[PDB]
């Protein structure tokens, strides 16, 4: 059991979902029609990949997932896409009118018209679980649906499922690919509203991913397709412990114990390696020591910030592929005596390690080189608060003049919700500052 239900909200959530589930299928040897030859238990099973896939009597392996968007054109591409047979039609839910980059429309005006239907379809998935573990919610900060509807959903999920774990994969906005000027507003509102309802959230800075695609894969002008195929690798690394087995395999919940020292401090910094093109990877083997040291290069982070100017509260290394503890320990010992790694005084300095022997997979026609071993570092650093600081500043510039606020007020919201949301963020920045101060 230990099933996990994925919920993909808005364009970003959906399209990242397409990348993730395509990648999952290739890792598990599942076909586009849902058939899995290697799986001999037909109609069911308690294998590790069953945490993400249910099984029909006809041998089809179905993603434990719901796709939701208040506009049909993105999900329509799923309905007619390569993996259309993979999902039951009821798993793909669409309205007719999006949130127009407006949090209010996503949370209230438009969202309320579909929220009950969504919860019902989510319930149908959960009833098929023999031991539901929690939810994974994919969404953007900037979109009206990704922000507004997600926060509404998270609120409703806490009511219908109590304290059942809810994890986020959140797309932090970047001007190179941003779609709205009001994304800072939507970002602060969703973060405030969701904060009490999320147990752990992995932020993905689009600018960080944009730079990595340009720098490491030599893509002149990365598309969402370029970004999403990279994101899915990070997501895969994080969920690998749930979808596979192994002696040295460490469950994500165990890392979570270390990563969240206080409820509000639940935003881990992800760093992935190696990101390299086929051209450069040829006749070039990146060892355990090399990919591990790369985790402490800020240019490889999912969020733009400087951990070297902050303090660590946890450090987790999630390896996959040809990796053994001996080489890991050697690599860590070297890194500790050359890198700027400083912990807060209330936390032990030991790195927590997990290894999944299943090697990295790549999607056909992708840009990422197929390597024998990869690593994803999950750290809890005060430096992530820099991402809040940048967003909150852009929020302040516009709100001082009440720019664009009338679009929100027009949809039923009040300025009190803006000030309430911004104050919670200021408290959050203060929280990250306090945890870094030495004990008395």
């Amino acid at each position: 059991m230990r099933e996990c239900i994925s919920i993909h909200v808005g364009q970003a959530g959906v399209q990242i979902g397409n990348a993730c589930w395509e990648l999952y299928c290739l890792e598990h040897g599942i076909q586009p029609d849902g058939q899995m030859p290697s799986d001999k238990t037909i109609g069911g099973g308690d294998d590790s990949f069953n945490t993400f896939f249910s099984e029909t009597g006809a041998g089809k392996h179905v993603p434990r997932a719901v796709f939701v968007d208040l506009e049909p054109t993105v999900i329509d591409e799923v309905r007619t896409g390569t993996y259309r047979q993979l999902f039951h039609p009821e798993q793909l839910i669409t309205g007719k009118e999006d949130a127009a980059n407006n949090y209010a429309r996503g949370h209230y005006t438009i969202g309320k018209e579909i929220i009950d239907l969504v919860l019902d379809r989510i319930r149908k998935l959960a009833d098929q679980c023999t031991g539901l573990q929690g939810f994974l919610v994919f969404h953007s900060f900037g979109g009206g649906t990704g922000s507004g509807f997600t926060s509404l959903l998270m609120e409703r999920l806490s009511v219908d499922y109590g304290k059942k774990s809810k994890l986020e994969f959140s797309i932090y906005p970047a001007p190179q690919v941003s779609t709205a000027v009001v994304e800072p507003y939507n970002s602060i509102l969703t973060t405030h509203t969701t904060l009490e309802h999320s147990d752990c959230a992995f932020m993905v800075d689009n600018e960080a991913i944009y730079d990595i695609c340009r720098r490491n894969l030599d893509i002149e002008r990365p598309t969402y397709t370029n970004l999403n195929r990279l994101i899915s690798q990070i997501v895969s690394s994080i969920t690998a412990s749930l979808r596979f087995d192994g002696a040295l395999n460490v469950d994500l919940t165990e890392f979570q114990t270390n990563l969240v020292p206080y409820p509000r401090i639940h935003f881990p910094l992800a760093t992935y390696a190696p990101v390299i093109s086929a051209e450069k990877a040829y006749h070039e083997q990146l060892s355990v020591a090399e990919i591990t040291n790369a985790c402490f290069e800020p240019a490889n982070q999912m969020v733009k910030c400087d951990p070297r100017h902050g303090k660590y509260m946890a450090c987790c290394l999630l390896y996959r592929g040809d990796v053994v503890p001996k080489d890991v320990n050697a690599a860590i010992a070297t890194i500790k005596t050359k890198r700027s790694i400083q912990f807060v005084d209330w936390c032990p300095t030991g790195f927590k390690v997990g290894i999944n022997y299943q090697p990295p997979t790549v999607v056909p026609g992708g840009d990422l080189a197929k390597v024998q071993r990869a690593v994803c570092m999950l750290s809890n650093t005060t430096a992530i608060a820099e991402a809040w600081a940048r967003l909150d500043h852009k929020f302040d510039l516009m709100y001082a003049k009440r720019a664009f606020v009338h679009w929100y007020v027009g949809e039923g919201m009040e300025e009190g919700e803006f000030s309430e949301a911004r104050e919670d963020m200021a408290a959050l920045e203060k929280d990250y500052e306090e945890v870094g101060v030495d004990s008395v």
């Binding site: 209010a104 209230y108 005006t109 309320k112 609120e155 409703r156 806490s158 009511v159 109590g162 304290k163 009490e196 309802h197 007020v409 027009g410 949809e411 039923g412 919201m413 009040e414």
Partner: protein
């Protein structure tokens, strides 16, 4: 000791239910306040357009009363 054990798990249940309860009410309050506001905004808009019709009637009336 057995008594303490009961009190702990009861407290856990109480806090969990209290969280669910407050979350349920806080949300119902927000959607209600939002429904009121949005309606009040659309109602005012129509009232201003309603005044434009009343004005136009007074204009057309003012014309024939100058002949």
């Amino acid at each position: 000791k057995r008594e303490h054990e009961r009190e702990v798990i009861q407290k856990a249940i109480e806090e969990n239910n209290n969280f669910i309860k407050m979350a349920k009410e806080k949300l119902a309050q927000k959607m209600e306040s939002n429904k009121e506001n949005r309606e009040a905004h659309l109602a005012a808009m129509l009232e201003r357009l309603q005044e434009k019709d009343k004005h136009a009637e007074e204009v057309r009336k003012n014309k024939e009363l100058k002949e």
